[PDB]
Design a protein around this ligand. Structure first.
Ligand SMILES: [Zn+2]
Lengths: 195, 175, 1111, 98
C-alpha cells in the first residue's frame, strides 16, 4: 500500500513538496460573483467568506510573528490558519463544518465538484439548452407516424430567427427590428411565413 | 478596544469604517431602547430627532447596515435548487442586439457611401467611427488641407443632406 | 340533517350515528386557546384536568421564573400574561400587509433578597400574532397555515434484535428525552451489558450503579436472579465510588483532569438537573406509565430520577430473561414487552401550541441569558425590570418561526376543501422530524394504530408518500399531545350511547367491534361471531359477550377529503388515494353546481371551512345586496355581513361570494347565508354534473384521454376566473428617484391610450403579453453613447432621453382585463419598507375557458387531459336527442380497478331522471331495507351515499329497473344500465348499447395556459453561461445526462455537440449562430464550452496543475 | 493552450508554489471586497481590478482611459491593464502564507 504511492512519486518527475502548501491560489472573481439584487440586497457565493477568513488569519499571523508573541499564541494562530485552509479546500471534512448565517454548511471548493449538484454531473454532462420548449401532450390519432402536432405559439417562439429572416426577405418588415416587433406583437402576416 | 475595533473592520463582508459603524450601533441601540418605552417601532423622523441630524441620513445609514446574502442557500421550502440559479447575467451579450448593431453598421456604411466621399470621411472621423477617437476640426483640416470653417460648412452640408427623408425613413426605423 | 338551511339530501344510510362530526377545525382553534389561555379553554380544562389549569404562556413563564444572580440576593420573576385587543381587523391587515397580531403584556416582580424591595412593572412583551376564526395566521398580508408535526414522544423504548451469528436475542433501550443526553442500555454480543452514555462505547453497568452511592452489596441484592448482570457485576474490576466517578469522567469529559467532587456534581448536572436534561411533561408521564413509578401523583420534577434508572435496568434485564411482568419495589406491576416506535401510543402530535411554545421557550432562554448577564453588571437599587428586559429576542424568535420555516407554510387555498385539508394535516418533516432521505420504508407504512386517528388513504403520491397525512374525521387531540378517537362501549352485549375516548395504547387492552354491525336496537349482535380488532391489530371472530367497544360510526378511519368520495368501498386503495388528492386541487368555477350523488360530509365540510357566510345570530333579513347583507336580529340590533367579491386566492383563483337569501326571509343561527367559491346552497360543489358515455370513441379518448362537447365551452359549464397580481416598486437610488410617470421614452401612442396621466393602466382595460402596465422610469446614469446613436439623433432630432425605461410589462403568455389597482407611497404616510417610496400592485383577471390539455378528473381516481373538444353534431346522442357531454375510455376502468365510479354513474342517472318504486302489492324484496322517502324521487333529485354504508348493488339495480321518464314516454336506459345511442358522425345507430349516466367531473388546477413554455434566446446564469430554468425566468429545458445517453446511443454526434456547446454554452458560438441563421448563412463550427473553462479554473484553484497539451 | 478545440491530451498533477505564483496576476493581501459607498472594488482586495482586470470594459480605476484605442497598455496610476472585461473570469490571484 505504501509502495503504491511511493513508486508514483518516484517514477513521475514531481517533487512531493506539493504535499505541503505555502502559497494558496485565488479563484477568479467572476467565478465567485458579488451581485446586487433588485432591492439593494447583495449576494455572494460563500467563497468570499472563506477567502476573507484565510486573509484575516494570515494577516494576524503576520502581525503576531513580526511583533513577537509567546509561542502558544503563535501556535494557536498557525492552527487557525491550517483549519481555515482546511475549510476553504474542503468544508466539513475534518471536524464540524464552518458555518455562516442561517446555520448551514458553507460550500467549499470540494463541495462544488461532488455529487449530483456538483459541476461534473450538473453543468458539464447535462446542460440547459436554448431553442427548446415543453407542453402537455394530447393524443393525435389523425396524425401520420412521422408527424407530430405543435402549438402555434410554441412554434413561433422556437422558430423566431427563422421566421424573422423569412419575413424580412419577403418585405413584410423593412428591417430586423421591425420583424422582431411584428413577431412579439404577433401580426397576422407572421403566421403564414411561420407555416 | 481591540475586540471592538476588530469586529468593526473585520466582521463584515462589506467592510465599513468604524467612524460610522459607531452610528449604526448607536442607531440600533436607541431605536430598540425607545421601542419598548413607546410600544411601537420608532419612525425614522423621531429617530432623527434623537440623532440631531436629518432623517434622510437615517434612511441612508439604515440601508447601509444591510449585510449581503448567500448565493448558495436553498431558496425553496423543499431542497432542490440554490439562489444563484435564478440570477440573470447582465453582462452577457444579448445575441439579438449584436446582430442588430451589425446590420445598423451595414446600413450606416451604405448611407455614408451613398453620400460624397469627402463628406463621408469628414463625418466618419468627426464621430470616430473607423478609429477609436473622434477628432476636432483642425485635424480634419490638416488631413484634408482646408480651414476649419470649410469643415464646419461641409458638416452643415452633411446633416442637411442627411435630413433627406430617403435616408431619414430608412434609418429612423432602426430604433 | 340538524342544519337550519340544509338542502334535502336523502340518504341510503342504514344505521344512525350517535354523535355528529365535531368541528373539523378544533385541532387548530383549541390548541391556540390552550396557548393563550382564553376563558373558553379555561372552562374546557375545568372538567378535563382542572387539577392544574395552566396555559402554554403561563407554563413557560412559570418555568422561567424565578431568575436570580450568582449571589441569590437579587432576582426577577414573571407572572400574569395578559393580552390586548388586535391592532386591526383581518381584512385591513390582509390589505396593507401587516401581521394580524396583538400586544402582549406581562407583570414582572423584581425582588432583592438582600434588603427587600418590590417593583411590579407591566412590561410590553411584544407583538404576538393571533389566530383567526378560520385557524389561519396572517403574516405580512399573506395567509399562512401551520401544520401539526408527528415526532417520537420522549420516554423509554425497549427493543429486540437478532445477532444473526448464534441467533441469540438481544434487548436494547434508548431513553430519548428532549433536550438531554441519551442513555443506551443493552445486552452486548457477549454476556455482559452495554451502558452507552452520550455515545461512548465502554463501561458496563458496574460503574453506573456504583456511581449512584451504592456498592457491590446493593447490586448483588437487587440482581441475584439475573445471571447476566451477576456475571457483569463479577466483571466489575473496579472498587471505589471515586474510582467509578473518575472512570466515568474519562468517558464523559476527557481533556480535563478529574477531581473528587467534579464527577459527582457532573453526573447530577448531566442527568438529574432539569437544565441540561429535562424530558418534557409528556416524557415524565410516559416513563411513569411505562414503569409504573407514580400512578396517582401530580406532574412535577420533569428531570429524570434515580429510581427511573433502576427501574429501566430491572425492566431491561427482566426482558432479556423473557419475563412477562415486572413489579418495581414501590410501584404497580407492568407487563414487559418491546416498544414499537410507529405505534400511535408512542408518536405524539406537536400542534400549533407546542411549536409556538418551543419557539417562545427559545426566546425566553435567550431572555434569561441576557437578563442574567445584565443583573450583575449594574449596581443594586439602580436597576429596574424595564432595563433588565430587552424584548428583541422574543419577537425575533416568533418572526423566525412564522417565516422561513417549513412547518408553517403558505396556505393551499384554491377551493374550500384544500383549505380544510391543509389544516388538520399531520406532517413528519422539519425540526425534530425526519427528512425524506432520513425516512425508511417502515415509517411510510400504515400502522394498525392509524385506524380512527390518521386516515390511511389521504397522502400525497410524490416522494412524501406516507410521511405526511391528514387527520381523521372523528379524531381528537388529548390535552397531552397524544391522539385520541371516540368509541361506544358495549357491556354484556348491550350497546350504550355513552361515548368514551381512547388513545392508541388504550385500545390494545380492549376489543373494539365492527362499525357496521347487525345491531338490533337492544345492543345484541344477532350472530355471536363479530369482526373485531384485537390487541395487536389482528382481525378475528369472537363471541359477542366478551367484546367491550365498538366504532362510533362508519367512515371513522377516513379523513374529510376521502369521506366525500361516493362508493369508496368499491375502489382500490391507490385510486381512492389519487382521487382524494385531486379533490384538493379542483378549481372554483363560475356557477358551482351541487353534485347529484355525494356524501353527507359535503355540507359540513363546506360549512366549517369558514368561507361561507353563516348567520351567527338568528333573525329576519333587513336587506340583501351583492356587496353586503343586513340582518335584523330578534333583539332589536342588526348586523351587516360585508360580502367579499372577486378576491384573489393564494393560487390565483376566484373567491366570489353570492348571497342565497331574499330580502324578507328568516334565517336561524347557524344557517348558511352566502356561498363561497365552490359551494351551492352551502354544500361543497367542486365540479359539474356531466352526462357520460363510456364508449371508446375513434381514438380521441385513447390512453385516459377524455373528449368533450362544445356545449361545455358555449354554455360556460367549465370555465374559471383567474386573477394575477403584479407588484412593482419605485425606490430611492444614488441616481436619484424612479418616477411612476407617463414620461416613457420612445413609445408609440396606440399603446399609450389605456394609461392615465398618473402613469398606470385604466381600470377595466384589456392588456396582453408585452403590454405596459405601470410607467416607471429610472435615471439611466451614463454609458457608452454609440457614435451611431449620435448620427441617429442627428437624422430625426431625437433627444438623448437621459433615463432608462425599465417599466413593468405583462410577462409572456397571459392577458385579460384589470380588476384593481392598489398604490402606496411615503407621502401617503404609509408603512412602506425603508428604501422604496412608491409601490403599486395591479390585478389582472381573465375568464379562462376550457381547452385542449386542461386536466379533468372524477373523484374516483380517473384522470386525463382533454383530447379534443368536438362540436355538438359529432356526439353520440340517445333516442331523445340529447348529446352526451363527456366521453371517457372503457379500457381504463377494469384494469385500473375503479369500478366505483360506474356505480356512481348509474346512481347519478337514476337521481337525474327520477324514479319511483311501485308500492302497490307491498314493497319489493330489495327495497325492504331501503328507507322510506327513498321509494320516490322527482327528476333532478339529489341523493347521498355514506362511503362505507351506502347503496348496495341490489338496491341500485332495483332503482335502475324503475327510472320514470321526464317529459316523453321514453325509458332510455334498460334494466342493466346500458342504453342505445345514435352516432353523430355517420348517423347510423351503434351496434351495441353502452352505459350512460350523470357523472360528477371537476377541472383541476393544471391548465395548459400555465403549462406551455418555449424560448429561443433568453438570459443566462452568472458563473456558467447556461440558460436559467423555470417559468418566471425565460427558462430553457434541462438536457440531462440521461438524454445524453440516448443521443450517444443513437450515434448522433453532431446533434449532441450542437445541443451542448453552441445551443447552451459557447457564448461566441451563440452569437455567431444567431447572426448566421438571421443572415441566412451556414451555421459555423461549434467552439469550446465555457463551463469546461470554468471547471479548469476551479480545479486550478484547488492546487491541481491542470494544463491541456496541443501535442 | 490556445483553446481552439485542437487537443491531444489533458494532464493533471501536483502544483508547487512556483506554479501557484506563476498563475497569479498579483498577490491579494487585504480582506476587502467592495467599498460600502462607492460600490467599487478595492486595491489588493479579493476583487481588486489591478490583479483580476477591469470590471468595466476598457477603463482603469480613475478612468484615465475610456477608449477602445487603448489596448494592452497597463496604466501607470493603478496598474489596471486596460482590456476586455471578461478577464475577470480568466485571471487568478494568490496568497502568500505566513
Ligand atoms: Zn485605472
Amino acid at each position: 500500500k505504501r509502495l503504491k504511492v511511493v513508486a508514483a512519486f518516484q517514477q513521475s518527475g514531481n517533487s512531493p513538496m506539493g504535499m505541503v502548501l505555502d502559497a494558496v491560489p485565488v479563484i477568479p472573481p467572476e467565478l465567485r460573483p458579488m451581485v446586487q439584487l433588485d432591492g439593494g440586497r447583495f449576494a455572494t457565493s460563500d467563497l468570499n467568506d472563506l477567502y476573507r477568513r484565510v486573509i484575516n488569519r494570515n494577516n494576524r499571523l503576520k502581525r503576531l510573528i513580526d511583533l513577537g508573541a509567546p509561542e502558544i499564541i503563535v501556535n494557536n494562530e498557525k492552527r487557525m490558519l491550517q483549519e481555515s485552509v482546511d475549510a476553504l479546500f474542503d468544508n466539513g471534512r475534518r471536524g464540524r463544518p464552518v458555518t455562516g448565517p442561517g446555520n448551514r454548511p458553507l460550500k467549499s471548493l470540494s463541495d462544488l465538484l461532488k455529487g449530483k449538484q456538483g459541476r461534473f454531473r450538473q453543468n458539464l454532462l447535462g446542460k440547459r439548452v436554448d431553442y427548446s420548449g415543453r407542453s402537455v401532450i394530447v393524443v393525435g390519432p389523425q396524425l401520420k407516424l412521422h408527424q407530430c402536432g405543435l402549438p402555434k405559439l410554441m412554434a413561433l417562439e422556437l422558430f423566431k430567427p427563422f421566421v424573422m429572416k423569412r419575413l424580412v426577405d419577403l418585405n413584410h418588415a423593412q428591417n430586423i427590428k421591425s420583424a422582431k416587433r411584428m413577431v412579439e406583437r404577433q401580426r397576422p402576416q407572421v403566421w403564414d411565413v411561420l407555416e | 478596544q481591540a475586540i471592538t475595533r476588530a469586529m468593526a473592520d473585520q466582521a463584515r463582508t462589506i467592510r465599513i469604517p468604524v467612524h460610522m459603524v459607531e452610528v449604526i450601533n448607536k442607531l440600533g441601540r436607541i431605536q430598540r431602547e425607545l421601542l419598548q418605552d413607546l410600544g411601537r417601532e420608532p419612525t425614522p423622523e423621531e429617530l432623527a430627532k434623537e440623532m440631531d441630524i436629518t432623517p434622510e441620513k437615517v434612511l441612508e445609514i439604515q440601508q447601509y447596515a444591510r449585510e449581503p446574502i448567500s448565493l448558495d442557500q436553498t431558496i425553496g421550502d423543499e431542497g432542490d435548487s440554490q439562489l444563484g440559479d435564478f440570477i440573470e447575467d447582465s453582462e452577457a451579450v444579448v445575441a439579438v442586439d449584436a446582430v442588430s448593431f451589425t446590420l445598423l453598421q451595414d446600413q450606416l456604411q451604405s448611407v455614408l457611401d451613398t453620400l460624397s466621399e469627402r463628406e463621408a470621411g469628414v463625418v466618419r472621423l468627426r464621430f470616430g467611427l473607423t478609429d477609436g477617437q473622434p477628432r476636432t476640426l483642425d485635424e480634419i483640416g490638416q488631413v484634408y488641407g482646408v480651414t476649419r470653417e470649410r469643415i464646419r460648412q461641409i458638416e452643415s452640408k452633411t446633416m442637411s443632406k442627411l435630413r433627406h427623408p430617403s435616408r431619414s425613413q430608412v434609418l429612423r426605423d432602426y430604433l | 340533517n340538524s342544519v337550519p338551511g340544509a338542502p334535502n339530501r336523502v340518504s341510503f344510510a342504514k344505521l344512525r350515528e350517535p354523535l355528529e362530526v365535531p368541528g373539523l377545525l378544533d385541532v387548530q382553534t383549541d390548541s391556540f386557546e390552550w396557548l393563550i389561555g382564553s376563558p373558553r379553554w379555561r372552562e374546557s380544562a375545568a372538567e378535563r384536568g382542572d387539577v392544574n389549569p395552566v396555559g402554554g404562556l403561563e407554563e413557560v413563564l412559570y418555568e422561567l421564573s424565578p431568575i436570580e444572580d450568582f449571589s441569590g440576593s437579587m432576582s426577577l420573576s414573571f407572572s400574569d400574561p395578559r393580552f390586548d385587543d388586535v391592532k386591526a381587523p383581518v381584512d385591513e391587515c390582509k390589505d396593507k400587509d401587516m401581521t394580524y397580531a396583538a400586544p402582549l403584556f406581562v407583570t414582572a416582580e423584581f425582588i432583592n433578597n438582600n434588603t427587600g424591595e418590590i417593583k411590579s412593572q407591566t412590561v410590553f412583551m411584544g407583538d404576538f400574532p393571533m389566530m383567526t376564526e378560520k385557524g389561519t395566521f396572517i403574516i405580512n398580508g399573506t395567509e399562512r397555515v401551520v401544520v401539526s408535526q408527528l415526532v417520537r414522544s420522549p420516554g423509554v423504548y425497549f427493543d429486540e434484535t437478532i445477532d444473526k451469528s448464534t441467533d441469540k436475542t438481544l434487548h436494547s433501550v434508548k431513553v430519548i428525552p428532549s433536550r438531554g443526553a441519551w442513555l443506551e442500555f443493552d445486552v452486548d454480543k457477549r454476556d455482559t451489558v452495554g451502558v452507552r452514555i452520550d455515545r461512548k462505547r465502554r463501561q458496563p453497568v458496574t460503574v453506573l450503579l456504583k456511581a449512584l452511592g451504592w456498592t457491590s452489596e446493593q447490586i448483588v441484592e437487587r440482581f441475584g436472579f439475573s445471571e447476566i448482570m451477576r456475571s457483569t457485576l463479577e466483571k466489575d474490576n473496579t472498587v471505589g465510588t471515586d474510582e467509578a466517578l473518575l472512570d466515568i469522567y474519562r468517558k464523559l469529559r476527557p481533556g480535563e483532569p478529574p477531581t473528587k467532587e467534579s464527577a459527582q456534581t457532573l453526573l447530577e448536572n448531566l442527568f438529574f438537573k432539569e437544565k441540561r436534561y429535562d424530558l418534557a411533561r409528556v416524557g415524565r408521564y410516559k416513563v411513569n406509565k411505562k414503569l409504573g413509578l407514580h400512578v396517582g401523583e401530580p406532574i412535577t420534577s420533569s428531570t429524570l430520577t434515580e429510581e427511573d434508572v433502576v427501574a429501566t435496568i430491572e425492566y431491561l434485564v427482566r426482558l432479556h430473561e423473557g419475563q412477562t411482568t415486572m413489579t418495581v419495589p414501590g410501584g404497580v406491576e407492568v407487563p414487559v414487552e418491546t416498544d414499537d416506535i410507529d405505534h400511535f401510543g408512542n408518536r405524539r402530535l406537536r400542534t400549533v401550541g407546542e411549536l409556538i411554545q418551543n419557539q417562545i421557550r427559545v426566546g425566553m432562554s435567550r431572555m434569561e441569558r441576557v437578563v442574567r448577564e445584565r443583573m450583575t453588571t449594574q449596581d443594586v437599587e439602580a436597576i429596574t425590570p424595564q432595563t433588565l428586559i430587552n424584548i428583541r429576542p422574543v419577537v425575533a424568535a416568533i418572526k423566525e418561526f412564522f417565516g422561513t420555516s417549513q412547518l408553517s407554510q403558505f396556505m393551499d387555498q384554491n377551493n374550500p376543501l384544500s383549505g380544510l385539508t391543509h389544516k388538520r394535516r399531520l406532517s413528519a418533516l422539519g425540526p425534530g422530524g425526519l427528512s425524506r432521505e432520513r425516512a425508511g420504508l417502515e415509517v411510510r407504512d400504515v400502522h394498525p394504530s392509524h385506524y380512527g386517528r390518521m386516515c390511511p388513504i389521504e397522502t400525497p403520491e410524490g416522494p412524501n408518500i406516507g410521511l405526511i397525512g391528514s387527520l381523521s374525521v372523528y379524531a381528537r387531540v388529548n390535552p397531552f399531545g397524544f391522539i385520541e378517537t371516540p368509541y361506544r362501549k358495549v357491556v354484556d352485549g348491550v350497546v350504550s350511547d355513552e361515548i368514551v375516548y381512547l388513545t392508541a395504547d388504550e385500545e390494545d387492552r380492549h376489543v373494539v367491534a365492527q362499525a357496521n354491525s347487525p345491531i338490533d336496537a337492544d345492543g345484541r349482535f344477532v350472530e355471536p361471531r363479530v369482526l373485531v380488532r384485537r390487541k395487536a391489530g389482528e382481525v378475528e371472530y369472537v363471541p359477542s359477550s366478551e367484546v367491550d367497544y365498538m366504532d362510533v360510526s362508519p367512515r371513522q378511519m377516513v379523513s374529510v377529503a376521502t369521506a366525500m368520495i361516493p362508493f369508496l368501498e368499491h375502489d382500490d386503495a391507490n385510486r381512492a388515494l389519487m382521487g382524494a388528492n385531486m379533490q384538493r386541487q379542483a378549481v372554483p368555477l363560475v356557477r358551482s353546481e351541487a353534485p347529484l350523488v355525494g356524501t353527507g360530509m359535503e355540507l359540513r365540510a363546506a360549512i366549517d371551512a369558514g368561507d361561507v357566510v353563516v348567520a351567527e345570530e338568528s333573525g329576519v333579513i333587513e336587506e340583501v345586496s351583492a356587496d353586503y347583507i343586513t340582518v335584523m336580529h330578534d333583539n332589536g340590533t342588526r348586523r351587516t355581513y360585508r360580502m367579499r367579491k372577486f378576491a384573489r386566492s393564494n393560487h390565483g383563483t376566484c373567491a366570489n361570494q353570492c348571497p342565497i337569501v331574499d330580502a324578507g326571509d328568516r334565517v336561524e343561527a347557524g344557517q348558511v347565508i352566502a356561498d363561497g367559491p365552490c359551494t351551492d346552497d352551502g354544500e361543497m360543489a367542486l365540479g359539474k354534473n356531466l352526462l357520460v358515455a363510456i364508449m371508446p370513441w375513434e381514438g380521441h379518448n385513447y390512453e385516459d384521454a377524455i373528449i368533450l362537447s362544445n356545449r361545455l365551452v358555449e354554455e360556460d359549464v367549465l370555465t374559471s376566473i383567474h386573477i394575477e397580481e403584479h407588484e412593482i416598486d419605485a425606490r430611492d437610488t444614488k441616481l436619484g428617484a424612479e418616477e411612476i410617470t407617463r414620461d416613457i421614452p420612445n413609445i408609440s401612442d396606440e399603446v399609450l391610450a389605456d394609461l392615465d396621466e398618473r402613469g398606470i393602466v385604466r381600470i377595466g382595460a384589456e392588456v396582453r403579453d408585452g403590454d405596459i402596465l405601470v410607467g416607471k422610469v429610472t435615471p439611466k446614469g451614463e454609458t457608452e453613447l454609440t457614435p451611431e446613436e449620435r448620427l441617429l439623433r442627428a437624422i430625426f432630432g431625437e433627444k438623448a432621453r437621459e433615463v432608462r425605461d425599465t417599466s413593468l410589462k405583462v410577462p409572456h403568455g397571459e392577458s385579460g382585463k384589470v380588476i384593481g389597482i392598489r398604490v402606496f407611497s411615503r407621502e401617503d404616510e404609509d408603512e412602506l419598507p425603508a428604501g422604496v417610496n412608491e409601490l403599486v400592485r395591479v390585478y389582472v383577471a381573465q375568464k379562462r375557458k376550457i381547452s385542449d390539455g386542461d386536466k379533468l378528473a372524477g373523484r374516483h381516481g380517473n384522470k386525463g387531459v382533454i383530447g379534443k373538444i368536438l362540436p355538438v353534431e359529432d356526439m353520440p346522442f340517445l333516442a331523445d336527442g340529447t348529446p352526451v357531454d363527456i366521453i371517457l375510455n372503457t379500457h381504463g376502468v377494469p384494469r385500473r380497478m375503479n369500478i366505483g365510479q360506474i356505480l356512481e354513474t348509474h346512481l347519478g342517472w337514476c337521481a337525474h331522471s327520477g324514479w319511483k318504486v311501485d308500492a302497490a302489492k307491498g314493497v319489493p324484496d330489495w327495497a325492504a331495507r331501503l328507507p322510506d322517502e327513498l321509494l320516490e324521487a322527482q327528476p333532478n333529485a339529489i341523493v347521498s351515499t355514506p362511503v362505507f354504508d351506502g347503496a348496495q348493488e341490489a338496491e341500485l339495480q332495483g332503482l335502475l329497473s324503475c327510472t320514470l321518464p321526464n317529459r316523453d314516454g321514453d325509458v332510455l336506459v334498460d334494466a342493466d344500465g346500458k342504453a342505445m345511442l345514435f352516432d353523430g358522425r355517420s348517423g347510423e345507430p351503434f351496434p351495441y348499447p353502452v352505459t350512460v349516466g350523470y357523472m360528477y367531473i371537476m377541472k383541476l388546477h393544471h391548465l395548459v395556459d400555465d403549462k406551455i413554455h418555449a424560448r429561443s434566446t433568453g438570459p443566462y446564469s452568472m458563473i456558467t453561461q447556461q440558460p436559467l430554468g423555470g417559468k418566471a425566468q425565460f427558462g430553457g429545458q434541462r438536457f440531462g445526462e440521461m438524454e445524453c445517453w440516448a443521443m450517444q446511443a443513437y450515434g448522433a454526434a453532431y446533434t449532441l455537440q450542437e445541443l451542448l456547446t453552441i445551443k447552451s454554452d459557447d457564448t461566441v458560438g451563440r452569437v455567431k449562430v444567431y447572426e448566421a441563421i438571421v443572415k441566412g448563412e451556414n451555421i459555423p463550427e461549434p467552439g469550446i464550452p465555457e463551463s469546461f473553462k470554468v471547471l479548469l479554473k476551479e480545479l486550478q484553484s484547488l492546487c491541481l496543475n491542470v494544463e491541456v497539451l496541443s501535442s | 493552450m490556445l483553446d481552439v478545440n485542437f487537443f491531444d491530451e489533458l494532464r493533471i498533477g501536483l502544483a508547487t508554489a512556483e506554479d501557484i505564483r506563476q498563475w497569479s496576476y498579483g498577490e491579494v493581501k487585504k480582506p476587502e471586497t467592495i467599498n460600502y459607498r462607492t460600490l467599487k472594488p478595492e486595491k489588493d482586495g479579493l476583487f481588486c481590478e489591478k490583479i483580476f482586470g477591469p470590471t468595466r470594459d476598457w477603463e482603469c480605476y480613475c478612468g484615465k482611459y475610456k477608449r477602445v484605442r487603448f489596448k494592452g497598455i497597463i496604466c501607470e496610476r493603478c496598474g489596471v491593464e486596460v482590456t476586455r472585461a471578461k478577464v475577470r473570469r480568466e485571471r487568478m490571484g494568490h496568497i502568500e502564507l505566513a
